[PDB]
Symmetry: C2
Subunit: 116 residues, 2 copies
């Protein structure tokens, strides 16, 4: 029924962006890819590498916005947890931009990812 | 005078981030030793991963190692500022089994380069 938090699981947020979880190793270290689809924003439609951690239903993942096609000069990190007939990951994220000088410049928000 | 591999950074609690590698893509590995008095998961290395992008940095550690578990994950987002190199960060701590975003703990750490 509901999708679980596993290796090879995909999750789509309220902007249409997808986290593709690839591996979760014996220690819970995560690899994957992220495709941003937030309308009006840059760094869309191409895969960005992700790393992070899973601990039971807790998860962190982070992406650097640089790949072979486009840079957005920043890094986003999500912290969240799995909840469940639809599996979801509820998160709070922080975005830090290269060249920042003040903590006030770190952007924050909430994403809820739903199973594919 | 910038974020580098093989560097050590100590926060206001006396906890140390050891940056071990920053690869060609800026992917980070390291270890974290928590030394905040009264807390568990102290004095032993916890593996770290993350990213560096110029002066921006993210790093995260799962609180499970060969010694003990604190059932949670901390993630830091921050930036390098500079004679003293520092990393100014905001962190979030998520606990296994949480049910509400209100349960994600937040704070600020400033790490000073100690070399």
């Amino acid at each position: 029924m509901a999708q679980e938090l596993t290796a090879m699981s995909a999750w789509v947020n309220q902007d249409g962006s997808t986290l593709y979880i690839n591996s979760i190793n014996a220690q819970g270290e995560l690899t994957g890819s992220y495709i941003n689809r937030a309308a009006g924003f840059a760094c869309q439609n191409s895969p960005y590498p992700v790393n992070g951690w899973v601990f039971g239903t807790a998860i962190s993942f982070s992406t650097k916005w640089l790949n072979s096609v486009e840079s957005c000069n920043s890094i986003t990190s999500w912290s969240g947890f799995y909840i469940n007939g639809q599996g979801k990951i509820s998160t709070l994220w922080q975005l830090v931009v290269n060249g920042s000088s003040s903590p006030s410049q770190i952007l924050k928000g909430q994403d809820v990812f739903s199973q594919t």
